[PDB]
């Protein structure tokens, strides 16, 4: 087998602007514990999704989508509209909602991917 053994989904309602980044967010993290060939994240693996066309959904902190270093910022948005380029689904997260502080623990940069891109799961 491979589907089944424990899994669940914390569905409950939100503002729906919030409530479309939390689903990504959701969506990916599910993904994230079981398959992280189809969740990436860190600005390098995203850009490699990128060139994979593989991105559903793009998740990034407005904070980082609007970063003091002009440099760092020219990266994350360039990838962003890089990845309409690439008719994927942006989703634009608030510092403020937890779905922020979540984010976080993967440098508030990631994307959902449509299939296992050929670079493996994660690693030791």
Same mark, same amino acid.
Not at 67 to 93: C, M, P, W
């Given at each position: 087998?491979?589907? /089944?053994?424990?899994? *669940?989904?914390?569905?409950?309602?939100?503002? !729906?602007? $919030? @409530?479309?980044?939390?689903? $990504?967010? =959701?969506?990916? &993290?599910?993904?994230?514990?079981?398959? +992280?060939?189809? @969740?990436? &994240?860190?600005?390098?693996? #995203? %850009?490699? @999704?990128? %060139?994979?066309?593989?991105?559903? !959904?793009?998740?990034?902190?407005? %904070?980082?989508?609007?970063?003091? =270093?002009?440099? *760092?910022?020219?990266? &994350?948005?360039?990838?962003?509209?890089?990845?309409? %380029?690439? $008719?994927?689904?942006?989703?634009?997260?608030?510092?403020?909602? #937890?779905?922020?502080?979540?984010?976080?623990?993967? *440098? /508030? #940069?990631? $994307?959902?991917?449509?299939? +296992?891109? +050929?670079?493996? +799961?994660?690693? /030791?």
């Amino acid at each position: 087998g491979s589907s /089944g053994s424990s899994g *669940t989904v914390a569905s409950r309602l939100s503002d !729906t602007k $919030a @409530a479309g980044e939390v689903k $990504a967010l =959701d969506d990916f &993290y599910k993904m994230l514990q079981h398959e +992280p060939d189809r @969740a990436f &994240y860190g600005l390098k693996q #995203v %850009e490699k @999704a990128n %060139e994979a066309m593989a991105i559903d !959904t793009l998740l990034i902190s407005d %904070e980082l989508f609007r970063h003091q =270093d002009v440099a *760092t910022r020219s990266r &994350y948005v360039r990838l962003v509209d890089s990845v309409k %380029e690439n $008719a994927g689904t942006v989703r634009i997260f608030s510092s403020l909602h #937890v779905s922020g502080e979540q984010l976080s623990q993967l *440098t /508030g #940069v990631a $994307a959902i991917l449509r299939f +296992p891109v +050929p670079s493996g +799961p994660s690693s /030791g």
